[PDB]
């Protein structure tokens, strides 16, 4: 995609309570958002070239 | 099959009796007509219904695949992921079918004996009150009227009532007619 250079990304699972600490000096791409996990339940990544079909 | 009933001595089966597995045709004087042995046929569809159910219910429990992901140097683990996940596919799906095919047979046999035992309870009744024709039917040596046949469909038949006329119809028929 034209570009040379590369992106590494990386993560974590922050418990409540507890914190986080970052420290740079360079090459940081830093957070803005991040993901509460609200609910925990089955689910499943499916692998399908398929669209919504309006059913149960 | 098995018993050497159903498609044996009792060669094929009647199209015209449509209230059960297993019955009885009768003939005298007063007509004829197909009965269903309630009992015999009630049995066999508790059999095969708790049969059914009991394959049903054992495959509840059975290898749910799920999908898991890999990178470009986790090939051998992907490898056994996969192989593993086919492999259980496969021993279920022996399982299945092996099954189904083993208890078509009993299923099959089953019946057969079911009818081999009906045309026993019949002829452990009669003995030689009434003559064993070989195509699994009985001629009565003597008068059996509507109320008679049905004492025994039911296990009712009462063979020292019937035995003296029996003996005197013997008698004729060794005479030669
Ligand atoms: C991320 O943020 C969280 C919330 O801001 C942090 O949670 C906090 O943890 C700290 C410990 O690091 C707790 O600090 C004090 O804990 C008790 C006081 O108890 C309080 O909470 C109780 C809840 O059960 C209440 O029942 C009490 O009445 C009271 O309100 C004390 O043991 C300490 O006070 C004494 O000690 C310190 C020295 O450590 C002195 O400085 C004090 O002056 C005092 O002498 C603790 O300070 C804090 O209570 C707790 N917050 C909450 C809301 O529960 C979390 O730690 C933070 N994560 C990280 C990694 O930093
Ligand atoms: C199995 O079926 C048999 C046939 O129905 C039955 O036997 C019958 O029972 C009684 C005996 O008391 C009689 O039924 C009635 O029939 C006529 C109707 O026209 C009446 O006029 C009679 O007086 C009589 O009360 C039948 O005669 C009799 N049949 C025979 C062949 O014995 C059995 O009872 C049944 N078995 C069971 C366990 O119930």
Redesign the interface.
């Known amino acids: 995609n034209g570009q040379s250079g590369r992106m590494e990304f990386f993560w974590t699972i922050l418990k409540p309570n507890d914190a986080i600490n970052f420290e740079s000096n360079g090459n940081f791409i830093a957070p803005e958002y991040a993901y509460k996990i609200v609910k925990k339940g089955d689910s ?4 399908s070239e398929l669209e919504y079909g309006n059913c149960n | 099959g098995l018993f050497g009933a159903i498609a044996g001595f009792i060669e094929g089966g009647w199209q015209g009796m449509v209230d059960g597995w297993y019955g009885y045709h009768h003939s005298n004087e007063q007509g004829s007509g197909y009965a269903a042995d309630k009992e015999s046929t009630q049995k066999a569809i508790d059999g095969v219904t708790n049969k059914v159910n009991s394959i049903i219910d054992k495959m509840n429990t059975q290898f749910e695949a ?2 898991r ?1 890999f990178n470009n140097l986790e090939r051998r683990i992907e490898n056994l992921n996969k192989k593993m996940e086919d492999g259980f596919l496969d021993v279920w799906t022996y399982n299945a079918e092996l099954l189904v095919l083993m208890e078509n047979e009993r299923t099959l046999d089953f019946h057969d004996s079911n009818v081999k035992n009906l045309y026993d309870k019949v002829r452990l009744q009669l003995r030689d009150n009434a003559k064993e024709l070989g195509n699994g039917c009985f001629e009565f040596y003597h008068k059996c009227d509507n109320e008679c046949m049905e004492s025994v469909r039911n296990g009712t038949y009462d063979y020292p009532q019937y035995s003296e006329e029996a003996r005197l119809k013997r008698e004729e028929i060794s005479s030669g007619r």
């Open positions: 499943t990544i499916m692998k | 799920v999908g992901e």
